[PDB]
Design a protein around this ligand. Structure first.
Ligand SMILES: CNC(=O)c1ccc2ncsc2c1
Length: 292
């Protein structure tokens, strides 16, 4: 019953209607759970983003609860700040920070990132992931689309709609969740899994940043998963174009056996990350500075 779920949700969200203090909604994007508008706080002129998820157009609508679990409990500097959540009509609305340097997908699609810039992205995702993983939270949809930048070039994780939680009582997850190309093979094999699955997907994102797209991006989703499961770790299209120090890094990420994969915390001490630049090194890549 759609109505029963709307009622369940009302019990966990902030009361009211944000359209009472917001002005001039403009669509800026779409995910798989919903769309993203920006609005203007009416009194102050600050901008915010509002994530709009229709309750009737979800694969599993119980995952919508993840938005509020994360907003309540797992806020952190390398994670998007989510301010309030409402039930509006038949939609859930999350008001959050507007990350105005946009998504990393736009950068990888049109640009050639260098290793200083790649290393800064990787560092900041791994800061986030170690902290989350230590609390047993697995993100489960790591990809360029999930990484947002501020105008001044600081990297934050987004799109926690598919995340899940592990612990002594529930030590592994079993669900088939994410975006096919970035899925870890243990996950595709339906092994029970842990946070190691985010480390694999980060690798795939490294390859995004190096090659421009993930492995097997030309096959339909179903066939490429078969491919990930069977064949060995995918190779850079452009192996010759990467320092041995970054090959050394990717090699610790794209391990098929989850037990021998690196952890977010171990990978923080890997030498490839010493090359990380500041935030400012990423600013040139953004569409508003790229051609200028
Ligand atoms: C393609 N753009 C986007 O999807 C986008 C951009 C900024 C932002 N700030 C909070 S959510 C969010 C999404």
């Amino acid at each position: 019953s759609h109505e029963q779920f709307r009622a369940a949700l009302q019990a966990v969200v902030d009361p009211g209607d944000p359209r009472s203090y917001l002005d001039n909604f403009i669509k800026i994007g779409e995910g798989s759970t919903g769309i993203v508008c920006i609005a203007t706080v009416r009194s102050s002129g600050k901008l915010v983003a509002v994530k709009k998820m229709d309750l009737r157009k979800q694969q599993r609508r119980e995952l919508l609860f993840n938005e509020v679990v994360i907003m309540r409990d797992y806020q952190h500097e390398n994670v998007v700040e989510m301010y309030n959540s409402y039930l509006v009509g038949d939609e859930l609305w999350v008001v959050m920070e507007f990350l105005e340097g946009g998504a990393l997908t736009d950068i990888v699609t049109h640009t050639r990132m260098n290793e200083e810039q790649i290393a800064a992205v990787c560092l900041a995702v791994l800061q986030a992931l170690s902290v989350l993983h230590a609390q047993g939270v697995i993100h489960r949809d790591i990809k360029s689309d999930s990484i947002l930048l501020t105008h001044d070039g600081r990297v934050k994780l987004s799109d926690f709609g598919f995340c899940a939680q592990v612990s002594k009582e529930v030590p592994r997850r079993k669900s088939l969740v994410g975006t096919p190309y970035w899925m870890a093979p243990e996950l595709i094999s339906r092994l029970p899994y842990g946070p190691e699955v985010d480390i694999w997907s980060l690798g795939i994102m490294v390859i995004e940043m190096v090659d421009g797209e993930p492995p097997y991006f030309n096959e339909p989703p179903l066939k490429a998963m078969k491919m990930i499961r069977d064949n060995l770790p995918p190779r850079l299209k452009n192996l010759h174009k990467v320092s041995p120090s970054l090959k050394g890094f990717l090699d610790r990420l794209l391990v098929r056996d989850p037990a021998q994969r690196a952890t977010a915390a171990e990978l923080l001490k890997h030498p490839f990350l010493a090359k990380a630049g500041p935030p400012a090194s990423i600013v040139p890549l953004m569409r508003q500075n790229r051609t200028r």
